[PDB]
Amino acid sequence: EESQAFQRQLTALIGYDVTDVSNVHDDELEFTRRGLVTPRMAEVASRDPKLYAMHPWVTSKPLPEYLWKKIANNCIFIVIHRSTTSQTIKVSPDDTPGAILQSFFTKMDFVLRVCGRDEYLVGETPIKNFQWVRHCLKNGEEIHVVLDTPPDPALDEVRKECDRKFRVKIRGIDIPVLLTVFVEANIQHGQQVLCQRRTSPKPFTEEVLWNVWLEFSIKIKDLPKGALLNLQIYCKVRLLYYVNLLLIDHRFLLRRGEYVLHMWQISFNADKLTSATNPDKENSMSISILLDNYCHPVRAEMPNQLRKQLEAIIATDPLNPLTAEDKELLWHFRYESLKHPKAYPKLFSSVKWGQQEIVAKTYQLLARREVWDQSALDVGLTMQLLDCNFSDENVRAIAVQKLESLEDDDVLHYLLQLVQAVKFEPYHDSALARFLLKRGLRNKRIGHFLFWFLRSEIAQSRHYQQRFAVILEAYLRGCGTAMLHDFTQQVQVIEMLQKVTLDIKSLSAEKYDVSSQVISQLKQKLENLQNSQLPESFRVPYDPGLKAGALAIEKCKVMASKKKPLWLEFKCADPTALSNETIGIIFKHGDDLRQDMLILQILRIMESIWETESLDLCLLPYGCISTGDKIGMIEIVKDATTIAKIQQSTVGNTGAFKDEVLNHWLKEKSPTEEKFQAAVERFVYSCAGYCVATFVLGIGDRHNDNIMITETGNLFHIDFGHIRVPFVLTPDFLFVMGTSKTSPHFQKFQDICVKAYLALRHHTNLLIILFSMMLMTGMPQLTSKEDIEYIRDALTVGKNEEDAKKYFLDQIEVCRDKGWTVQFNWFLHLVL
Ligand SMILES: NS(=O)(=O)c1ccc(Nc2nccc(-c3cccc(C(=O)N4CCCCC4)c3)n2)cc1
């Protein structure tokens, strides 16, 4: 009974039971579980036991100019410790950890490990290329390391185990409880409706029947792999219910027989694409159908003017619509289009997918992919082939092929969007799902995040938990025994804190002030938790290098906000840690943290864009992971406060705002004038960073209670769930900058803003694809073409840089012209 016990262990880890068949009409999930064995085993056998155990976090990107500034000597200072003794050593930027190790004995079995972190500076890499080294250089910190024995790879031990038209009979529809109603049947492939048929409208009663065959113009031989039968109910004509059925199964068989499909009720989006059925069989709407159908499935140069029209089509942004003329030209000139990697999304949208001979021709075109294979990886371009507009296996596989060249550093930037893009896959087993599994199995940091990202979707997505649960098991069956124990300890702690979060929430109203009553109750529930249930220690989910110990209960509190988040603090479970600082984690219910995750990740990507142009915009995209429905954890950036709180420390709970208050607060919060000048510099940069980022994302218009600042001048926006001024640049921000006109700080700010804004515009398409993907996968509501179009207008598409500069400076002027108006209107709306 060891085998069942291990499965029982995996089930608690996943947050779902993969061995359950309650909501299946086929064996695709069992087939995927078997399908994923070999990809996992091939990777486990390939991984370096030593490098896997120490997981160096490295990049092959050049040191940015802004970071070379701190090395104007060509020397890097590393503090090598051993108990009370610690010696500073002079190192070259090109020096490898082994070279630093040898020269250490020259001055005075072992490996260098960061103080208070499961972070190792090891392998054939210049130290300047380790992330922690670059983290320290950016935040002027000393590079403190420890001399210790490497971890034992034995801990990572892996446990050994037909020419006729298509038709569908719509029998009827049934709901036990809930007007006119009708059914719409769609043959879909890439959100594209190849064929549509409707039934007659009828009164909406608990059981509505038709028994009418809906014959489609398309032949059974012409149905492409990944084609969906989309069944929708309409009740003003509003969509009310949907469900999908993959017409061709995982084994390439045409779907046959009677189907009783439990439908999703509407509350456009990735949830609308799911082939999963609503698991609630007692209350949901049902659709009964019958599938009868039987089957088993030297060029001429372009003229000067046509080539001009073709290139113009390829130059347009990703959300530019294709005319039938555009599609015809892209298709007729297939072979010329092939020489332009940027044409691939537009060219693949020109393929007549519901024609077997065209598909065959598309596959013919792909067989000779020298130009694609040789192209410089373009993540923006590659992500476009992994969205909702492409169901083709072969087209999606060529995009995955390009992601194979991404280094760990880059996989981490895109991991979240790549886990989400799995929602766009017609089948559970895919090249993308196999790529995600492989990379997670290859690297401990990717794997850690892959665990939490899948777990987040498994906990709350009825539409995708089944598929996502199968991928997580596949990752859990090869990560190793140490990681399996690691995850079990994080899961136990989060499970235990989620319950405490909910019970406290169930003791306090919306904004009804936090009293000693609920505070006593928190410290009581935490005491019972710690004494028995709380394990030894655990890795911090949004910071796997950090290890949290015992709860500092005396420091734990209930925050005064509508939602009642827990403020928790833990001792670092690592003796070698230089600081005597606790780990602060917020546990919250009430906000959809999935949206925040997506926003926070786009910010880290925006930081990476600015880095490739030697810019540091001082963003603070704090750790955040969604653990369930409206619940999750937030990294406490200690010694920070809300902009509204600074205003209320002087004038109280009034919209009556003052300008000098933030500047007063910063000077008052500074230990020396040197540090105060540094803080104004940090403010100018971080303000600019957030003004460009939030403007680009259409999340600029915000209430100051959702804008925070550190005692070190670092501004940072918070609470991104469920979201006039283009951005926040109020009189108090301007006063810190020396204006109330112009200023050397205000002019520096305008310059930083312009530089950052044009740096983002050089990655317009990448930003368009990440944004649309986010709107499609993160928002529970259905998305329109309008919502997606915002970012195109904000990125001043088809505009010169001088015009773009002119544009961003006008946005800065609107914030000056509006002053405190919008902030005051937010206070009247939200505070009252
Ligand atoms: N002095 S204080 O206002 O209690 C305070 C609050 C938070 C932090 N540190 C931090 N560092 C990163 C992200 C977030 C953060 C992000 C999103 C939401 C919240 C939040 O739930 N509150 C509600 C209560 C007031 C503030 C916002 C906090 N906080 C530091 C101090």
From Swiss-Prot:
Which residues get modified to Phosphothreonine? T764
Record's GO cellular component terms: cytoplasm; cytosol; membrane; phosphatidylinositol 3-kinase complex, class IA; phosphatidylinositol 3-kinase complex, class IB; plasma membrane
Q: Which residues bind ATP?
A: 584-593, 619-627, 716-723
Q: What is known to happen upon mutating R761P?
A: In IMD97; loss of phosphatidylinositol-3,4-bisphosphate 5-kinase activity
**Official protein name in the record:** Phosphatidylinositol 4,5-bisphosphate 3-kinase catalytic subunit gamma isoform
Description of activity control: Activated by both the alpha and the beta-gamma G proteins following stimulation of G protein-coupled receptors (GPCRs). Activation by GPCRs is assisted by the regulatory subunits (PIK3R5 or PIK3R6) leading to the translocation from the cytosol to the plasma membrane and to kinase activation. Inhibited by AS-604850 and AS-605240.
Subcellular localization, per the record? Answer: Cytoplasm; Cell membrane
UniProt keywords, alphabetically: Angiogenesis, ATP-binding, Cell membrane, Chemotaxis, Cytoplasm, Disease variant, Endocytosis, Immunity, Inflammatory response, Kinase, Lipid metabolism, Membrane, Nucleotide-binding, Phosphoprotein, Serine/threonine-protein kinase, Transferase
Q: Which residues form the PI3K-RBD domain?
A: 73-149
Q: Which pathway does this chain act in? A: Phospholipid metabolism; phosphatidylinositol phosphate biosynthesis
According to the UniProt entry, the coiled-coil residues are: none
Q: Which PANTHER family match?
A: PHOSPHATIDYLINOSITOL 4,5-BISPHOSPHATE 3-KINASE CATALYTIC SUBUNIT GAMMA ISOFORM, PHOSPHATIDYLINOSITOL KINASE
Q: What is the effect of changing R702P?
A: Abolishes protein and lipid kinase activity. Does not abolish interaction with GRK2
Task: Name all C2 PI3K-type domain ranges.
Answer: 162-292
UniProt lists the gene as PIK3CG
Q: What is the stated purpose of this protein?
A: Phosphoinositide-3-kinase (PI3K) that phosphorylates PtdIns(4,5)P2 (Phosphatidylinositol 4,5-bisphosphate) to generate phosphatidylinositol 3,4,5-trisphosphate (PIP3). PIP3 plays a key role by recruiting PH domain-containing proteins to the membrane, including AKT1 and PDPK1, activating signaling cascades involved in cell growth, survival, proliferation, motility and morphology. Links G-protein coupled receptor activation to PIP3 production. Involved in immune, inflammatory and allergic responses. Modulates leukocyte chemotaxis to inflammatory sites and in response to chemoattractant agents.
